Amino acid sequence: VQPLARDAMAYVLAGGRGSRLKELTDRRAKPAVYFGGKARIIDFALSNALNSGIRRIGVATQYKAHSLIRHLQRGWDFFRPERNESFDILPATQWYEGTADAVYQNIDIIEPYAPEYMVILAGDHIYKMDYEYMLQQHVDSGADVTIGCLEVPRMEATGFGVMHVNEKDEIIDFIEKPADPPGIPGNEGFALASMGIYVFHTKFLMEALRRDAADPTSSRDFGKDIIPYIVEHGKAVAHRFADSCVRSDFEHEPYWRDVGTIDAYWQANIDLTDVVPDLDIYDKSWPIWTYAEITPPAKFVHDDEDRRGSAVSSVVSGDCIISGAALNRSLLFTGVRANSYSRLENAVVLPSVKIGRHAQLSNVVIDHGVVIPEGLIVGEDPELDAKRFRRTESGICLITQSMIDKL
Amino acid sequence: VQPLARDAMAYVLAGGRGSRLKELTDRRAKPAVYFGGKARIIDFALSNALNSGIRRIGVATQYKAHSLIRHLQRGWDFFRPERNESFDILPASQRTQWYEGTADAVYQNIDIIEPYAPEYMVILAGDHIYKMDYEYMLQQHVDSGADVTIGCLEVPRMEATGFGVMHVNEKDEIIDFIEKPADPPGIPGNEGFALASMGIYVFHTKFLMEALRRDAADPTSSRDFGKDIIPYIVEHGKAVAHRFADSCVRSDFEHEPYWRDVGTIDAYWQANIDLTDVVPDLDIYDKSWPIWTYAEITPPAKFVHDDEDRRGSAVSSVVSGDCIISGAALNRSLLFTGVRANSYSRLENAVVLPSVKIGRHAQLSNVVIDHGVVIPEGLIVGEDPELDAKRFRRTESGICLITQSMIDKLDL
Amino acid sequence: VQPLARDAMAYVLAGGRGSRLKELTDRRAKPAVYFGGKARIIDFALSNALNSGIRRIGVATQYKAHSLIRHLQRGWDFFRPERNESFDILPASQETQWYEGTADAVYQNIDIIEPYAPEYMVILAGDHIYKMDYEYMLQQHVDSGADVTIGCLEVPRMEATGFGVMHVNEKDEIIDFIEKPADPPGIPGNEGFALASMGIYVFHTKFLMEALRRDAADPTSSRDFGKDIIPYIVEHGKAVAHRFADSCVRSDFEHEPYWRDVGTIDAYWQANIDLTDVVPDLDIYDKSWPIWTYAEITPPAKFVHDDEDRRGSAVSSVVSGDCIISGAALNRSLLFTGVRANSYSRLENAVVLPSVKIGRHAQLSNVVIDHGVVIPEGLIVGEDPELDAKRFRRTESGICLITQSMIDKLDL
Amino acid sequence: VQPLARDAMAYVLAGGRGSRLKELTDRRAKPAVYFGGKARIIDFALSNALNSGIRRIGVATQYKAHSLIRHLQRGWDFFRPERNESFDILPAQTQWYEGTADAVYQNIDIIEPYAPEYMVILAGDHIYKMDYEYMLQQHVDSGADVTIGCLEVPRMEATGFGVMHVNEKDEIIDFIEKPADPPGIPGNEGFALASMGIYVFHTKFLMEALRRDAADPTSSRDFGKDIIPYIVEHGKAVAHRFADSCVRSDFEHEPYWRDVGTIDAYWQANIDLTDVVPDLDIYDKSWPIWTYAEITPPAKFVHDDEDRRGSAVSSVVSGDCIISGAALNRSLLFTGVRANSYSRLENAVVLPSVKIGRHAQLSNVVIDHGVVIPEGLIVGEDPELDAKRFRRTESGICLITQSMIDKLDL
Ligand SMILES: CCOC(=O)C(C)=O
Numbered sequence A: 001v002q003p004l005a006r007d008a009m010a011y012v013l014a015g016g017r018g019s020r021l022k023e024l025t026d027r028r029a030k031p032a033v034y035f036g037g038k039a040r041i042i043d044f045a046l047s048n049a050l051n052s053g054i055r056r057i058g059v060a061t062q063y064k065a066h067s068l069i070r071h072l073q074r075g076w077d078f079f080r081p082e083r084n085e086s087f088d089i090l091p092a093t094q095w096y097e098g099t100a101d102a103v104y105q106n107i108d109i110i111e112p113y114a115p116e117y118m119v120i121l122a123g124d125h126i127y128k129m130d131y132e133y134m135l136q137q138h139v140d141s142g143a144d145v146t147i148g149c150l151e152v153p154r155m156e157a158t159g160f161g162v163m164h165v166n167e168k169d170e171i172i173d174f175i176e177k178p179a180d181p182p183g184i185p186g187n188e189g190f191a192l193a194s195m196g197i198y199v200f201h202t203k204f205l206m207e208a209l210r211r212d213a214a215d216p217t218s219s220r221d222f223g224k225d226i227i228p229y230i231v232e233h234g235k236a237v238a239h240r241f242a243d244s245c246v247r248s249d250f251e252h253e254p255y256w257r258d259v260g261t262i263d264a265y266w267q268a269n270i271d272l273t274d275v276v277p278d279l280d281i282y283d284k285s286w287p288i289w290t291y292a293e294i295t296p297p298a299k300f301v302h303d304d305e306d307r308r309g310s311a312v313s314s315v316v317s318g319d320c321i322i323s324g325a326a327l328n329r330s331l332l333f334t335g336v337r338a339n340s341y342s343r344l345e346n347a348v349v350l351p352s353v354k355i356g357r358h359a360q361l362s363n364v365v366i367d368h369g370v371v372i373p374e375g376l377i378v379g380e381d382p383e384l385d386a387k388r389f390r391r392t393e394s395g396i397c398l399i400t401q402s403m404i405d406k407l
Numbered sequence B: 001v002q003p004l005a006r007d008a009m010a011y012v013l014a015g016g017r018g019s020r021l022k023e024l025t026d027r028r029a030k031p032a033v034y035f036g037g038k039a040r041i042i043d044f045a046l047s048n049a050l051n052s053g054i055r056r057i058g059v060a061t062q063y064k065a066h067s068l069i070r071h072l073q074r075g076w077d078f079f080r081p082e083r084n085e086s087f088d089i090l091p092a093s094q095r096t097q098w099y100e101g102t103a104d105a106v107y108q109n110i111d112i113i114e115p116y117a118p119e120y121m122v123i124l125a126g127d128h129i130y131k132m133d134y135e136y137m138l139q140q141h142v143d144s145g146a147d148v149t150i151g152c153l154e155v156p157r158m159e160a161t162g163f164g165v166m167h168v169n170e171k172d173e174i175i176d177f178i179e180k181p182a183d184p185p186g187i188p189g190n191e192g193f194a195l196a197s198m199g200i201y202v203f204h205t206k207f208l209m210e211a212l213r214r215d216a217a218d219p220t221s222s223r224d225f226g227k228d229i230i231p232y233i234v235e236h237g238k239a240v241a242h243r244f245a246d247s248c249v250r251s252d253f254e255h256e257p258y259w260r261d262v263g264t265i266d267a268y269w270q271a272n273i274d275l276t277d278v279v280p281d282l283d284i285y286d287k288s289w290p291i292w293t294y295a296e297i298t299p300p301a302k303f304v305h306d307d308e309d310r311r312g313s314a315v316s317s318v319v320s321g322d323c324i325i326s327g328a329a330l331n332r333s334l335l336f337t338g339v340r341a342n343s344y345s346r347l348e349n350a351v352v353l354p355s356v357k358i359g360r361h362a363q364l365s366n367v368v369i370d371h372g373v374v375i376p377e378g379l380i381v382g383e384d385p386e387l388d389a390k391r392f393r394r395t396e397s398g399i400c401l402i403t404q405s406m407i408d409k410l411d412l
Numbered sequence C: 001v002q003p004l005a006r007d008a009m010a011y012v013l014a015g016g017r018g019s020r021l022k023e024l025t026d027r028r029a030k031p032a033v034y035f036g037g038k039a040r041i042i043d044f045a046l047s048n049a050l051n052s053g054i055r056r057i058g059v060a061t062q063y064k065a066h067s068l069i070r071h072l073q074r075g076w077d078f079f080r081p082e083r084n085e086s087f088d089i090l091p092a093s094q095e096t097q098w099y100e101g102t103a104d105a106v107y108q109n110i111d112i113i114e115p116y117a118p119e120y121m122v123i124l125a126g127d128h129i130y131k132m133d134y135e136y137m138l139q140q141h142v143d144s145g146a147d148v149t150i151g152c153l154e155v156p157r158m159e160a161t162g163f164g165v166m167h168v169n170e171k172d173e174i175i176d177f178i179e180k181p182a183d184p185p186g187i188p189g190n191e192g193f194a195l196a197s198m199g200i201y202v203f204h205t206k207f208l209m210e211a212l213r214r215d216a217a218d219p220t221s222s223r224d225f226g227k228d229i230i231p232y233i234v235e236h237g238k239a240v241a242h243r244f245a246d247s248c249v250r251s252d253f254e255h256e257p258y259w260r261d262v263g264t265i266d267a268y269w270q271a272n273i274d275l276t277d278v279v280p281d282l283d284i285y286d287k288s289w290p291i292w293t294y295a296e297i298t299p300p301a302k303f304v305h306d307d308e309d310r311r312g313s314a315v316s317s318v319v320s321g322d323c324i325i326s327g328a329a330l331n332r333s334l335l336f337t338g339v340r341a342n343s344y345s346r347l348e349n350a351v352v353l354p355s356v357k358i359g360r361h362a363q364l365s366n367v368v369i370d371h372g373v374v375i376p377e378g379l380i381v382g383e384d385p386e387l388d389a390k391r392f393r394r395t396e397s398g399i400c401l402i403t404q405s406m407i408d409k410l411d412l
Numbered sequence D: 001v002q003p004l005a006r007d008a009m010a011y012v013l014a015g016g017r018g019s020r021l022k023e024l025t026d027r028r029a030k031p032a033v034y035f036g037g038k039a040r041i042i043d044f045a046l047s048n049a050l051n052s053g054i055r056r057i058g059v060a061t062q063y064k065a066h067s068l069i070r071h072l073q074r075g076w077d078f079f080r081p082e083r084n085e086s087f088d089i090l091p092a093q094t095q096w097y098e099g100t101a102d103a104v105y106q107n108i109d110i111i112e113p114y115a116p117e118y119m120v121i122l123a124g125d126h127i128y129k130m131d132y133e134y135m136l137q138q139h140v141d142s143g144a145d146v147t148i149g150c151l152e153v154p155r156m157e158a159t160g161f162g163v164m165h166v167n168e169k170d171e172i173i174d175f176i177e178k179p180a181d182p183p184g185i186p187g188n189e190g191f192a193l194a195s196m197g198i199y200v201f202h203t204k205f206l207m208e209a210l211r212r213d214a215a216d217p218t219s220s221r222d223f224g225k226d227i228i229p230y231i232v233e234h235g236k237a238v239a240h241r242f243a244d245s246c247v248r249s250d251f252e253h254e255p256y257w258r259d260v261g262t263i264d265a266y267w268q269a270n271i272d273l274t275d276v277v278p279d280l281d282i283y284d285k286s287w288p289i290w291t292y293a294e295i296t297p298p299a300k301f302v303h304d305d306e307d308r309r310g311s312a313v314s315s316v317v318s319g320d321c322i323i324s325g326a327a328l329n330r331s332l333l334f335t336g337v338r339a340n341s342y343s344r345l346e347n348a349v350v351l352p353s354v355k356i357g358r359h360a361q362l363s364n365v366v367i368d369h370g371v372v373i374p375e376g377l378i379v380g381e382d383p384e385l386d387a388k389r390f391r392r393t394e395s396g397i398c399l400i401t402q403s404m405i406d407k408l409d410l
């Protein structure tokens, strides 16, 4: 009768470096990377927790955590312990020694709350999911551990940690990036790919992490140490994302993105410019809370022979002034100033960027606050572009202020 | 050394009906009228008080006040009394027996004011759009020894005819007060201008309390500052004028001191649509004197479709969050939060209030569209003046105000 | 799988006058009355809604709602609509509009409710003190297929005479409703007990809007849930009782399910003073079902003087913040925030509301002192029944309610 | 006309170890130490900033700053940048701060976007009330490079201070660390100016000064030892008298400033709040001290028979305290303290959530946060049994921590 969420604590692992994002994550953690025009990546796991009815949240951070922590302080500031809500920011010769460690080192903060269930979450994915489903499967299945999994074509699973299960979705082995991924019994050509989401009873986990602290062998991670141990010595069960996913009617399939490369990151944002986007950012039934300030509305100015400030097939945030600049298939975060005779196409423009007059840019991700010099051309000369900026094989240039200065 | 604002309470009169705004205020007070894409009118006086360092605010409401009051409860909710801040929402009888006037609006609330014991009271009109630093006006008030300091616009005399006008001597001491003078008295030194009352009054609090008690005890008083309290002091006390230009907070992108009454639909339309200029008279992108309001986290603005027949786009326009511009042409328009403009529609010279829906093929020009209106598909406005005058409120200059009740009546 | 509370709106009827509480409610509505040292009565229904996971709450107020509305504005200010949460304060007057009854209180505000489109409405009285998890009642409602679920106390029949009583069958289906039955029908199989309505009702929103629109067009209706809406469904539709015992959130340290009307001065006094017990019926130190309220940061409680003639200390008492007990003796008393009790004074069996000041040498016994009352030096209460009755509101059991207007008229 | 606080930013140095406070700062920085019953020491500087009209605040922290950082996030969370308000918590994002100067230098990246005119450098480990608008007004007028807040102290007590030589217009002509013969004030000998560690700068000037300091690989990167000694000698340093800006309540007999540097001083400043006429008026609503506070139940006193009586005399007691058959005298209790039957506290400062077991009897103590006092424990009866059981000062105050109690089998 009583929702299990009332007795759950969501614990967000937010230390992921986002290595392959290169300069995008040079001074910010992957979960602090901007997404969608208004939010950051971590706001999704956090909003899922909130919307699922989980009132206690812990967030473990590791490297380059400064701006991630300031985001959390500014945006996620409305929890009060007298309402049995909490939001603890838990930063790391003093780092965490893995994903399991960050729970272990913080037991003293967890146990006063004494939650019945722990919902361990990866904070660097973009998805919407109602965790109450997973909680209910967990208590009703008697599992030691319930693991959230995507169903992906066997070929795609080769990059995931893959769970080998049986006909009752109990997990019988785990393999990191199996090159020939174990298929679902009775449904080959599909594999169960781990989402980095783990539901525990709280007391089992506590011991499970104590045990891990003691063992010299352990790399102190959930994926390699905690879980496989459980898989081999206890009862592990799979939960399928399709069962819990909160998809809008206007989302043609369950949405989940890792945005683990500049290409995947650029594509995921630019896809929001579609007539029918994969992600329905207008689904008010499952809203994404974030840090946002009061801003002026977007402004478009100039319209004559040679210049017209306008956006077409584009998404534009507040505090943006589009002055004689032509935008197409671009997403602009808050605060962008684009000036006369400049042009943007296939552009993901992060907060507070200035585009100088006459600049022309195509297929780019422009980093936070970058000032684009007047006249710069990107997307015309693949080879000059690759020398000046971080350019992908697909031809997306990631542009940072450091890159511009060296011009 | 100490700023006087620490010792002041701002008391905002927010019962303005905005009668000439017609259907725009049939269900809301004038201070609750939307402006500029995000805020409401009352947010300017409150942001002035905040930015000036005043920590205690009272707001007296009168007619049609629920949405104003809701706005205040939700947007102005961050003042804490044990930090010596306060924000009091004060409707007629206890959050018949209406306020009998603006002075009554204070008098009835003496028991709210007195516990705070502020040293000064700043009486504000909540129905004007303007930026002002009240600390200068406080300074002048104590340093001049006046009974009342009155905020005054310095306007050419032909404009002052619709204002309450203060007559000036050499030292800017007010020597009489005229309500809407046919030929306004001028300022000594430079004739050609007049001092028009802003409805801003600074008192020593104790002085003010005695006045409103005296006004309450006068059986022939109409119970207003403008008509009753102020004329009494101008004569039998010391009234002094403060010049708006001296306290006005101008951005360096604002060519002149900005103050707007938006007392008519043309004025309302004109003040909003002027924000679409390359160089508007009001700088809303300024940060050195910010306007706080009630704002919700919204998805960004979206523009879509780009084919032969339809292009979602905004030109020389201002567009807010949660707007979806789908195959619709926007030109010289101001869109508030939550507008959904649909394929093949067109908007020119439009002020479009929150949550409006523009149906496919609809074409609207020179309009103000009320909050939440659902424009039916294919509707045409701005083309047939007599038909346009027939179904909607239409001004002499050709502006159409459109409400849902007007749309509901549509069959011809 | 999905908790029904996500889909419910709580609607709190906070218009109780508390007539029998006499002077205690001469300027405040009953839901605004102080309870327990810090909170107000309305905070129990609101905290129940919040703890049950209901994110949308409306409060309908009626008479003397000034201080109630103020409390709700400052205390219950943390709901944000973009997180699908909302807190609407819905005063009977945007004067002329008064709600015609508890049913009119909803009907007039349909245009506040339907935009949120909740699936369930939970109608609550805002003037009782109790803890209850409404998810239990929601589930029963959807499982039972009923048109209304009604929350009911299980009370011994001779105490049931004072209540609105539902007749019940073996399936807890309500076959009749009786207002104050001289002989309350017992529960089948459990005579000796009867079901008393708590004035708590769960509906599907679509059904409730239907019923409310039917009621408004019926000119004979008293427009109340109690007299009109519920009895109509009882005879013509499907009403089922829900047992408070099943939903009540009882602490380990509460010997039974706790519910209190505090309808009389004696009952009010009794319910507060009971908190000074070694083992109170109400466990306020519970953290598993917390009661939220408006609270300010205050200094701690202070106890001073210990000489031969005066000692400030409290025995068998509960004392809040900002209290200074200066050479004063407290015994079996409950003090709200900001009480100043001065040298040589004594309080016994006293419920003392916020900001009360107790003058030197005063000695008060068996009292309720209203908010902000200054007790003059040397006043004696609880010594002479006839004198105390002449001066104050004295109950049959000898409880004196003391208000400042009673003190003002005094001099023996 | 325009108050200078509008253009100022307060930067609070909150990395003090409070080394002499021993186990009381075992796992927390000094600014995080509880004071007065409901607040922490850092809240005083912060409330001074806010009350003075300084709506931009940064806090630099160093060692053991977890609870300090949590307190700040929870309690000081009401600033919004779009109202030109900001509160930045700046932990050491290797590379600890090199000193209080380095604490500023690393965070130029945080400061410049706000571009304030003035920087008000504040020690976050003192208890005092001050209106910084006076010191700002003096600084801009004096035309000096740095203005330094100073206590006026009798020279006999100035020997334990950083003392500023002054001339007849309060220009600082020397700074001496703990002078044996502290230089006296011109025409007011017998009083010396003792630095409060409060400095006012122009922001541009301070950025240069901290950039120069960072370049010198020799420097100890501290305002006290490096930057301030450089300005007196080569630039323009001027003193600001605490008495000139202190916010002294009518019920405060003298300007109040406390360092609470030692266990005895900490105990003394807290227990002094139980006085009939305390030196610190914690009721002056005119200059209020904001902190992190939760809604809690009122304090409760229960039991009253021949053998036990729950009550407090000459005491200060917070919310969520249950005094159950326990007798308190001259004690200050923070939130959530449970004292059980037949127990007795005297001259006791008891930090939050402490449990006092039945029959326990304690005198002259500071009990650390959350400590559970075993039933029947006696402290303050036997000085030598106490000094080996707990940390006991020369004056006879016992600091009791949980790790000390856990060692008990004598
Ligand atoms: C807060 C941002 O508001 C906006 O004006 C848009 C366009 O998103």
Ligand SMILES: CCOC(=O)C(C)=O
Pocket: C296, C297, C298, C299, C300, C301, C319, C320, C321, C322, D294, D296, D297, D298, D299, D317, D318, D319, D320
């Ligand atoms: C805010 C907590 O207040 C109290 O209950 C006491 C006694 O300080």
